[PDB]
Symmetry: none
Subunit: 78 residues, 2 copies
């Protein structure tokens, strides 16, 4: 269960949205961790893990550049 | 790449406070990831990255069990 990187998120996201964005994918519900900066504000980045390595590879390829609200998100890893 | 987990932080913590905890080490900026469960609630846990294995090992051993707020933080990694 590799973890993948998720960038360029709107800063209006929620945890439900991120998980929904991965609907149909073998994602781990309590694996999301949101990155913030020194000023206490989100950076639009987060880490998300899945049940397998082929499921993380499948997400990155399949959902890269796709949108969460308005922002087209960028995926990488593992 | 060399990330570590942090646990036992009060549920309400700021990044500015966390960075204070890791002063003197090369914590990759913006890498501080706050974790959430499948309910989308604060876990008191985070992930943090360093540039080398050496600095993530150096942080885990020195700072392990020090406070952030009123709790003795627990480090695990790389």
């Amino acid at each position: 269960p590799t973890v993948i990187k998720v960038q360029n998120m709107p800063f209006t996201v929620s945890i439900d949205e991120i998980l929904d964005f991965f609907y149909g994918y073998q994602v781990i519900p309590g694996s999301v961790c949101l990155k913030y900066n020194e000023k206490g504000m989100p950076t639009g980045e987060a880490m998300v893990a899945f049940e397998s390595r082929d499921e993380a590879t499948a997400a990155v390829i399949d959902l890269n550049d796709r949108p969460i609200g308005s922002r087209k998100v960028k995926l990488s890893g593992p």
